[PDB]
Structure 1
């Protein structure tokens, strides 16, 4: 017999922060001898 209007809210996630990771800055920060052992793992640093 008597009505009204109600209001609801909804949140839908559509995005996410885009992170970027690399081999050098994460494993061998500034050590030159560290990069020598990384040369053997040459291919396993671009697929990441």
Structure 2
């Protein structure tokens, strides 16, 4: 017989923070022997 109007709310995720990782700073920071041994694995860091 009598009515009213009510409101709700919701949140749907759409985006995500973008992350960028490199091998020149995570595995071998600045050393040369590590880089020489890392290149032995081939293109293992080109896929990440």
Fold equivalence (TM over 0.5)? yes
- Cα distance, 1:32 vs. partner? 1.8
- Cα distance, 1:34 vs. partner? 1.2
User: Scaled by the length of structure 1, what TM-score is found?
Assistant: 0.88
Unaligned runs of 5+ in 2: none
Please tell me the root mean square deviation across aligned C-alpha atoms, in Å.
0.9
Aligned residues: 48
- Cα distance, 1:10 vs. partner? 0.6
- Cα distance, 1:42 vs. partner? 2.7
List per-residue Cα deviations over 1:1-48 (Å, max 9, x = no partner): 111010000100010001011111110111222111011123101101
